[PDB]
């Protein structure tokens, strides 16, 4: 019963947003700065993240499937009660 | 030539037939793999019923003492993990000997190809080729190898690999050879489960000279189609790792600024370099006329896409926004191709990619400078005779079951 | 895989300096060595280059005669003997290594990717 | 053509000169070779144990004006800080002729001495007294980098670990003629002991600060991590832990599986105990037999708590909390929780990055309040913050050279 | 000798002002960041405010800022929380806590025991008409 | 006699009598012992942690190189037993 979105590329700052019960399919987040953004009860299917910075951003009770995070700062503490299935983090924005 | 061809195994109309005209029969028994991109290539195994039997016509069965003859084919031998095959055991793949083992045989050992010729009396003579373990990059392991065997009854029997002579013993002491009625492609007495690839099996009734053997080596696979690392046909919409011919011990990686590095040293399993390291690319048709197939040909206009994940491709382009002569190759996160195409071409098994403008202008062949993958026009005038010529040559490595690395 | 330069200082018009760059991780057999200058306000400007395998040294029009590039027989230390120094020479000087197997172009205004390794730099000041 | 006129290095069971000037190096008696780094050798004084360099005639110093430099690393154990407590100067490196012309490296109680004498008997001595450990010592039983530069028209300078600590003029010294032989041998020490030496170099110039610091940084392999003593960090070796920001504290286990840092080290006179707290062992994730036991930069490893000699439990980051920082926990079940540790270093200091198997960053090993944690804070505060060094660790091996009862 | 003892909590009418005092022993305020943390009737701990004294820096939970005021007095070794304009939902047990300055300086909104080196006993603060 | 090794017990053991065992590198972590007895058993390089006991004894047993961390296995629970190089650390005294 999730609002679906597919094959979308996003490349702009996202501020002060709560997205609940969403299903992003093959989404791209490239050069995005997250600011006080919360994803709840969402599924990320075959999504892609690149050059992402985050502040006060969390993923609560979310599912990630076959999702790649390249050059992001989305460290572990940002994923609360979430499950990552075949999701990879490559070349994190530190460490 | 063709005047000398007394047996030619070719794929036609759902099966394998003889195109020599002498009408030899060919039968598939069990599960024989047929390569989708080249059905003249087939694979036999030893874990189930899997064989090819050629019943030779009564006219071509070798039963002389003085008649020269040649045998030609290509074989593909995978080592898998490179451990399971490490065992001293000669197993046969092609058998053309009667009940009394008179005739000829092609047999395999660990990284070894053996040819055996035995007369009616029982006198035999063997040639061999041992290519050894991969030290860096292997030119033989899991690749198509061209095997030629010429037999001058009044002289030596010669074994050629890839058109080059590697072994020659004399056969003067052999008398009458009555080869088998059947030529059996089957893996017999192998310690382990495996498969073997065979293609372009030919028998000729003369001693082929180096010129004819080289003509076969050059012309048998379609010169118009580009080849991959293993020596199969290069495909569209297929993920490939890259290998630079001048820098075999290095692989290509992505940089955060969208550039490509070449200063990454390949790991080693024993001596052998890892082939499955670095970025993946896919070749895409620019003019998708639909009717055309997935094989990459000479002078094809293509797009080279970088694979971020299975479903996320991004154009690779030449960044012409610099004062340098050579242009860095970059990844386009927006999907913009920047009004560029790539022209594919080939020298043997080595591939060239010419980045060009849509207005028809040259940007350069894909090479490297210092530590970065670039496009350069320099190669145009230094493609043959220079220390750095081979910098513009590339191999496309497909992740396959026959080469396992973990 | 490091380069460290030294030998820079303050001098008068007509003086002399000897810049050295010590390398770790590689020898000059597999890399062409280079000196590149950065004067205040301007972009990077290639000074000199040497191929150790050969006897081929390269200079720019503006320094030929006064500057000499050298390597030792150990093939791990790079030298630039600078003489008859003019005030226009005042700049930070970097030693750099190019992979010899790459395209042998020499851009006069190089970016970071023109060379495999850059040094830390050494200051050269020509003052009256 | 290099400035290096002598370089003592290891090849195929003996020491050779790699400079190019072909000096001979001979071993006499029982000279110890460090397995993990054979460039390092130990000499004793309770038996025949010496190394003799026969210098090439081309490089033997016999001038009045030619600048020259000497460099090496020395390791000097105290054993108990008792047996060594005797005021007596003893030689370890001799390049002095029959008339005491040349140069000499000697030791004393927590002291390194350099002597340079000419043909007329005019000399100058430089020294460094590092003294007894007050808390943590950067010298005792550690590898110390010694460098001596000599400008014949100026000062003789003594550097320890890249830092200039002593200088004196040698303008009054005329012709210096060093010995044909350089003798590494503990001579006239009143007690039995051994000394470590490595990377002996003679240069025909006065090294500047930049060159000295380069040698200091690069002579030990930067790719390989170091232990507390300055040797290579090893896999499958028991280590105590030291936090660089908290030298007077040691790590202890709690009953809840957490690691505490609010444990003050006992002192022996002024010297913190090193052999206190939990022991850990580093384990390769992907192990081959071709791989050695050296821990390198970016190695993926597991850090195991040593409950007993034969009982190891994986240390992991407990992510099941609402805090950004995650407490480090001992896994009594043996479960690794799909986590890995990446090793790295800055100089002699080590970092441990707790990550998920999928590549997700959990944090560098540090502390918050009184508990050992993994924190992402350190990622952006490695250098210039008061609390930066909280993520730097030393691995202390229990060794014969440092004893405490 | 390490101890924290809080006093000053009681019942004051809505819009009132209180002055909590945490007397500490065993350490100096130069070595420890000080904090006030509240616990509601059965809810999880909620961080209220913190102070770094070596440099005057203060930190307030967004709701608290402007109303409350944290202070220290190396003078009398006493930590102060000057309440004012009390609201009904500020009713809780108020503990003082000391965090090692040298550790990760994060401020968790809902801390656990390991977020601070030392805790107090807690003074009740009720606000009802 | 009956050798078990390289094992880990994390559950409650109730009303049992184990005889003639030879445990090698056993682990007893979080175990609650209720009326359990070990007789003529050998504990070789074993490890106990967070162990509470009630009416539990080790009769005619031998311990070698065993560690007891955070346990209540006090002296009186070892009847006619040998403890060789066995250490008790941070007992559940209070
Ligand atoms: C996103 O675009 C892809 C194409 O890349 C869509 O996949 C195609 O779906 C159509 C209709 O189902 C098929 O005819 C194509 O063969 C598919 N192409 C490929 C390459 O798979 C995909 O469905 C789009 N996302 C959605 C669900 O809207
Ligand atoms: C959001 O939370 C609910 C509650 O935990 C999750 O639903 C459960 O999910 C697990 C795994 O799929 C199942 O075993 C249960 O059947 C589910 N329980 C219920 C109440 O349906 C759900 O997985 C979470 N959703 C996301 C996007 O992570
Ligand atoms: C000739 C042959 O048998 N090929 C095999 C191919 C590859 O061509 C192989 O890697 C070549 O070496 O893979 C398979 O199709 C597969 O795993 O599904 C099985 C097949 O048997
Ligand atoms: C250079 C040197 O003297 N090494 C000594 C080593 C090292 O101290 C230790 O193995 C690692 O630091 O220990 C000895 O083998 C020992 O146990 O008596 C003596 C030996 O001389
Ligand atoms: C996910 O990973 C598994 C193994 O971890 C692998 O077999 C497969 O390719 C991936 N795909 C899915 C969705 O299982
Ligand atoms: C326990 O594990 C060790 C480690 O390999 C092994 O040597 C031993 O045989 C094992 N013990 C038994 C008997 O299972
Ligand atoms: C407890 O022990 C059992 C049996 O050895 C094991 O299956 C289980 O994983 C252990 N721990 C947990 C997770 O309860
Ligand atoms: C027990 O410890 C002593 C004390 O040094 C030692 O001699 C011996 O090796 C140990 N014995 C056993 C049972 O391992």
Numbering used by the authors:
A (entry chain C): 488 to 582
B (entry chain A): 847 to 1252
C (entry chain B): 2 to 129
D (entry chain D): 848 to 1252
E (entry chain E): 1 to 129
F (entry chain F): 489 to 582
Question: What text comes from the article?
Answer:
During late-stage structure refinement, we noticed electron densities for an unknown molecule located in a pocket formed by four tyrosine residues (e.g. Y879, Y881, Y891, and Y1041) at the N-terminal sub-domain of HCE (HCNE), which is about ~25 Å away from N573 of SV2A. Taken together, we hypothesized that this unknown density could represent the distant portion of the SV2A-N573 glycan chain, which had a low occupancy at this remote site partly due to glycan heterogeneity. We, therefore, carried out systematic crystal soaking screens using component sugars of a typical complex type N-glycan, including monosaccharides sialic acid (Neu5Ac), N-acetylglucosamines (GlcNAc), galactose (Gal), and a disaccharide N-acetyl-d-lactosamine (Galβ1-4GlcNAc, LacNAc) that is the smallest repeating unit in most N-glycans. Based on a 2.77 Å resolution structure of a sialic acid-soaked HCE–SV2Ac–G6 crystal, we could clearly see a sialic acid occupying this mysterious pocket on HCNE. The electron densities at this site for all other sugars that were carried out in parallel crystal soaking studies were similar to the un-soaked crystals and could not be modeled. Structurally, this sialic acid is sandwiched between Y879 and Y1041 on HCNE, surrounded by Y881, Y891, and H1247, and with associations further strengthened by several hydrogen bonds with R922 and N988 on HCNE and G1248 of HCCE. These BoNT/E residues are discontinued in the primary sequence, but converge in 3D to form a pocket that accommodates a sialic acid that is frequently found to cap the termini of oligosaccharide chains of N-glycans. To examine the functional role of glycan-mediated interactions, we designed BoNT/EY879G/Y1041G based on HCEY879G/Y881G and HCEY891G/Y1041G, in which both Y879 and Y1041 of BoNT/E that sandwich the sialic acid were mutated. Remarkably, BoNT/EY879G/Y1041G only retained ~0.1% neurotoxicity despite its intact binding site for the protein moiety of SV2A, strongly supporting the direct involvement of the N-glycan of SV2A and SV2B in BoNT/E binding and function.
